[PDB]
Amino acid sequence: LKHQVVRAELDRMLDGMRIGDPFPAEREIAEQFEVARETVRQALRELLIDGRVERRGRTTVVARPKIRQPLGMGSYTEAAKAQGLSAGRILVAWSDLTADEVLAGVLGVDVGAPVLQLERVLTTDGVRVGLETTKLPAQRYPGLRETFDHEASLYAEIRSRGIAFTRTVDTIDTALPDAREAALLGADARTPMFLLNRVSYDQDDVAIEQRRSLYRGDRMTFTAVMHAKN
Amino acid sequence: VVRAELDRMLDGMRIGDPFPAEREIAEQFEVARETVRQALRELLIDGRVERRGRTTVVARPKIRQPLGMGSYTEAAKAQGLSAGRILVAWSDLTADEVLAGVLGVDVGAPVLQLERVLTTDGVRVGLETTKLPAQRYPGLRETFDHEASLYAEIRSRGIAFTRTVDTIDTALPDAREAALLGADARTPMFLLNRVSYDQDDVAIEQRRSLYRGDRMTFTAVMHAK
């Protein structure tokens, strides 16, 4: 059991420390908890893989873990919850736009059709994670500004309107922020970003949204589990 | 005939070549300016052209790779781009406690590592480092064509890829990585880490892939059911 107890003691240590705090050396810890030095080494390496600690020269220090978000139709806040992390969303702005030729094609609406755009910043533990710009065919969502809690999951709101998320199509690229994106996200011109572009489709294969998400690479990891059979 | 005409043009143009102005193209093919404008704009979305000031120029397209169990070279072939793999090195390792856990092998078990660089149209795209449980693949190092698909070779040995687990991170290259990929310390990269599992859910590999962000786009098509 001494190998299980050391892992629990490191978790308890972690609860009380700040980001950047160094752990005692591996040998001191091992002796504190009557386990091998290699046992402490391994538990620290597991924390590191979990994003909860990082190396600083010879030392292991407390890190702010990246949110590990599954690719698919799940939620940003649910992903962070799963890791014991506190995520939120902040309204940047609603914008009323119209669909140009390209966007009309993506959403399968008429050229000129009304588009409602929601822009929000995603946060975790007091720091900015990403900027989410969702363009919606406005005709599909009357009252959305009225019925929608802008801090909540838009996907849950869309599901509550009888619209099921049946198919998503993502592109994932790297990027750098422009001046506005950098200011919104506490970043600079050199900060590495993920740039995802999504179109979602409902049970009738009718487009739900086109969503652009620009995430700071230092605050986000994406995970994707694929099966051969389906 | 306008998306086709532009395709025909791109065929003959070099990276960096500027198209004629929107109005000229429109008048050349007897279509509206808006029609030319839309076609160039979706060519831009496909990554095949890019803006340079007031002009639109031919771009080197990013390879569009579906996440999953398909082929890198097949993906590039889908876009009419030539793609290949070049041997860096084979290495003989032993599994540490972490890797032994990942591969479901004993600690100390022999590990055969294959490192290769991925190229498209003469330029480097990525560094692929595959760690294999050596016991699973007798004779691989001696016989395998390192330019070919390792996934095809593993399947040829009776091992089907059934499940894959990817993590995707951003990264910057170290000195060696920068040298291998024609990059510098500031070049944005994708760092992908995969574990793949066979028909019995036994690990096949642990694969690290470091790609130049300027040469790679990942795509994912997901279904609810």
Residue given tokens 């994406």 in the structure block: A222
Q: Name the residue type at position B40.
A: L
Experimental method: X-ray
DSSP state of A22: B
Q: Name the residue type at position A98.
A: T
CA distances (Å), origin B152, targets A6, A226, B93, B148, B209:
43, 18, 23, 8, 18
| SS3 state at A8 | helix
Q: Residues of B with CB below 8 A from A226's CB?
A: 67-69, 163-164, 166
Across chain A, which distance is largest between two alpha carbons, in Å? 71
CB contact at 8 A, A35 and A50: no
CB contact under 8 A, A226 and B166: yes
Residue given tokens 């889908």 in the structure block: B78
Residue given tokens 């407390």 in the structure block: A62
DSSP per-residue codes, A103-155: HHHHHT--TT-EEEEEEEEEEETTEEEEEEEEEEEGGG-TTHHHH--TTS-HH
CB contact under 8 A, B218 and A172: yes
Question: Which of B59, B66, B24, B55 lies closest to B45, judged by CA?
Answer: B59
Residue given tokens 């979602």 in the structure block: A200
CB contact at 8 A, B152 and B140: no
Structure tokens at A115: 């588009």
Q: Residues of A with CB below 8 A from B165's CB?
A: 223-225
CA distance B124 to A51: 30
| B-interface mutation test, from A39, A68, A170, A173, most B Cβ less than 10 A away | A173
CA distance B94 to B134: 9
Across chain B, which distance is largest between two alpha carbons, in Å? 71
CA distance A103 to A95: 15
CB contact under 8 A, A169 and B224: no
CA distances (Å), origin B143, targets B129, B134, B140:
19, 14, 5
Residue A34, Cβ density class (10 Å: 0-12 exposed, 13-18 middle, ≥19 buried): exposed
Q: Residues of B with CB below 8 A from A172's CB?
A: 168, 190, 217-220
Question: Which of A93, A107, A112 lies closest to A136, judged by CA?
Answer: A107
CB contact under 8 A, A169 and B219: yes
Structure tokens at A171: 């592109």
The alpha carbon dihedral of A23, A24, A25, A31 has a sign of negative
Phi-psi region at B47: left, alpha or beta (left = phi > 0; alpha = psi -120 to 50): left
Domains of chain A, CATH where assigned: 1-65 (1.10.10.10), 66-230 (3.40.1410.10)
CB contact at 8 A, B173 and B189: yes
Q: B222 forms bridges with which residues in the sheet? A: A168
Q: Which residues contact B175 (CB under 8 A, 6 or more apart)?
A: B185
CB contact under 8 A, A168 and B42: no
How far does the CA of residue A158 sit from the closest CA of chain B (Å)?
15
CB contact under 8 A, A190 and B189: no
CA distance A61 to A17: 10
Residue of A102, A176, A227 with shortest CB distance to B163: A227
DSSP state of B95: -
CB contact under 8 A, A173 and B223: no
| SS3 state at A98 | strand
CA distance B44 to B40: 6
| SS3 state at B187 | coil
